[PDB]
Homo-oligomer: A and B are copies of this chain.
Amino acid sequence: ADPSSFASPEKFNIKHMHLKLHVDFTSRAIAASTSLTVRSLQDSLASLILDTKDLTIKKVAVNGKDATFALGTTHSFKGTPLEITLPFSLTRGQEVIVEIDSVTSPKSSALQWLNKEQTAGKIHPYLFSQCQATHCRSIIPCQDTPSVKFTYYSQVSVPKELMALMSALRDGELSEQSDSNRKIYRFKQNVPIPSYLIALVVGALEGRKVGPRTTIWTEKELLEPSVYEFAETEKMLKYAEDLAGPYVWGQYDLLILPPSFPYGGMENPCLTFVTPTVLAGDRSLASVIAHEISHSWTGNLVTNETWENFWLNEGHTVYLERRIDGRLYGEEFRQFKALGGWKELQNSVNTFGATNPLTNLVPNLHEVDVDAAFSSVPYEKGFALLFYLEQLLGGPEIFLGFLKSYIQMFAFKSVTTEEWKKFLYSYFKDKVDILDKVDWKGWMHTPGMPPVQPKYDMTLANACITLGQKWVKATESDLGSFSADDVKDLSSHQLIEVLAILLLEKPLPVSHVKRMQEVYNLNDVKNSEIRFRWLRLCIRAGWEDVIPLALAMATEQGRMKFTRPLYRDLYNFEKAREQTVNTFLKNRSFMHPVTEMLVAKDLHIS
Residues in chain A within 8 A of chain B (CB atoms): 15-16, 18, 20, 35, 37, 39, 63-64, 87, 91-97, 152-155, 171, 186, 188, 245-246, 248, 405, 408-409, 411-412
Q: State which of B15, B16, B94, B155 has its C-beta within 8 Å of the C-beta of A18.
A: B94
The answer on a CB contact under 8 Å between A245 and B93 is: no
Of A95, A186, A188, which is in contact with the most chain B CB atoms at under 10 Å from its CB? A95
The answer on a CB contact under 8 Å between B245 and A408 is: yes
* 14 pairs, A vs B, C-beta closer than 8 Å: A15-B15, A18-B95, A37-B37, A63-B97, A64-B87, A92-B186, A93-B153, A93-B186, A97-B97, A245-B405, A245-B408, A246-B405, A248-B408, A412-B412
- How far apart are the CA atoms of A408 and B152 in the complex, in Å? 22
Q: Contacts of A35 on B, CB cut-off 8 Å?
A: 94-95
Q: State which of B92, B93, B188, B409 has its C-beta within 8 Å of the C-beta of A246.
A: B409
Separation in Å of the A92 CB from the closest CB of chain B?
Answer: 7
Q: Which residue of B lies closest to A62 (CB)?
A: B63
Q: Which residue of B lies closest to A409 (CB)?
A: B246
Q: Contacts of A15 on B, CB cut-off 8 Å?
A: 15-16, 37
The answer on a CB contact under 8 Å between A95 and B93 is: no
Q: Contacts of A152 on B, CB cut-off 8 Å?
A: 93
- How far apart are the CA atoms of A62 and B39 in the complex, in Å? 17
Of A39, A154, A405, which is in contact with the most chain B CB atoms at under 10 Å from its CB? A39
Q: State which of B64, B92, B188 has its C-beta within 8 Å of the C-beta of A64.
A: B64
Q: Contacts of A248 on B, CB cut-off 8 Å?
A: 408-409
The answer on a CB contact under 8 Å between B94 and A95 is: no
Kindly list 14 other residue pairs between chains A and B, CB separation below 8 angstroms, not including A91-B155, A93-B154: A15-B16, A20-B91, A35-B95, A37-B37, A63-B64, A92-B153, A92-B171, A93-B152, A93-B171, A93-B188, A94-B153, A95-B97, A96-B97, A248-B408
Q: Contacts of A97 on B, CB cut-off 8 Å?
A: 63, 95-97
Q: Contacts of A188 on B, CB cut-off 8 Å?
A: 93
Separation in Å of the A244 CB from the closest CB of chain B?
Answer: 10
Separation in Å of the A176 CB from the closest CB of chain B?
Answer: 13
Q: Contacts of A18 on B, CB cut-off 8 Å?
A: 91, 93-95
Q: Contacts of A405 on B, CB cut-off 8 Å?
A: 245-246
Separation in Å of the A413 CB from the closest CB of chain B?
Answer: 9
- How far apart are the CA atoms of A154 and B248 in the complex, in Å? 30
Q: Contacts of A155 on B, CB cut-off 8 Å?
A: 91
Separation in Å of the A315 CB from the closest CB of chain B?
Answer: 21
Q: Contacts of A64 on B, CB cut-off 8 Å?
A: 63-64, 87
Separation in Å of the A456 CB from the closest CB of chain B?
Answer: 32
- How far apart are the CA atoms of A550 and B186 in the complex, in Å? 64
- How far apart are the CA atoms of A411 and B191 in the complex, in Å? 11
- How far apart are the CA atoms of A18 and B15 in the complex, in Å? 14
Q: Contacts of A411 on B, CB cut-off 8 Å?
A: 408, 411
Q: Which residue of B lies closest to A404 (CB)?
A: B245
Separation in Å of the A603 CB from the closest CB of chain B?
Answer: 45
Of A15, A20, A152, A408, which is in contact with the most chain B CB atoms at under 10 Å from its CB? A408
The answer on a CB contact under 8 Å between A16 and B95 is: yes
Of all A-B residue pairs in the complex, the 4 with the closest CB atoms, nearest first, are: A93-B153, A63-B63, A246-B409, A37-B95
- How far apart are the CA atoms of A411 and B152 in the complex, in Å? 19
- How far apart are the CA atoms of A309 and B18 in the complex, in Å? 32
- How far apart are the CA atoms of A15 and B97 in the complex, in Å? 13
- How far apart are the CA atoms of A248 and B413 in the complex, in Å? 11
Separation in Å of the A6 CB from the closest CB of chain B?
Answer: 24
The answer on a CB contact under 8 Å between A39 and B63 is: no
Separation in Å of the A483 CB from the closest CB of chain B?
Answer: 50
Q: Which residue of B lies closest to A17 (CB)?
A: B95
- How far apart are the CA atoms of A39 and B37 in the complex, in Å? 10
Q: Contacts of A93 on B, CB cut-off 8 Å?
A: 18, 152-154, 171, 186, 188
Separation in Å of the A239 CB from the closest CB of chain B?
Answer: 14
Of A87, A94, A409, A411, which is in contact with the most chain B CB atoms at under 10 Å from its CB? A94
Indicate whether A39 sits within 8 Å of B20 (C-beta atoms), given known contacts A97-B63, A411-B411: no
Q: Contacts of A20 on B, CB cut-off 8 Å?
A: 91
Q: Contacts of A94 on B, CB cut-off 8 Å?
A: 18, 35, 153
Separation in Å of the A259 CB from the closest CB of chain B?
Answer: 35
- How far apart are the CA atoms of A153 and B43 in the complex, in Å? 12
Separation in Å of the A386 CB from the closest CB of chain B?
Answer: 19
Of A37, A93, A154, which is in contact with the most chain B CB atoms at under 10 Å from its CB? A93
Q: Contacts of A95 on B, CB cut-off 8 Å?
A: 16, 18, 35, 37, 97
Q: Contacts of A96 on B, CB cut-off 8 Å?
A: 97
Separation in Å of the A394 CB from the closest CB of chain B?
Answer: 17
- How far apart are the CA atoms of A96 and B95 in the complex, in Å? 9
Q: Contacts of A16 on B, CB cut-off 8 Å?
A: 15, 37, 39, 95
Q: Which residue of B lies closest to A189 (CB)?
A: B93
- How far apart are the CA atoms of A93 and B156 in the complex, in Å? 13
Q: Contacts of A408 on B, CB cut-off 8 Å?
A: 245-246, 248, 408, 411
Separation in Å of the A417 CB from the closest CB of chain B?
Answer: 19
Q: Contacts of A154 on B, CB cut-off 8 Å?
A: 93
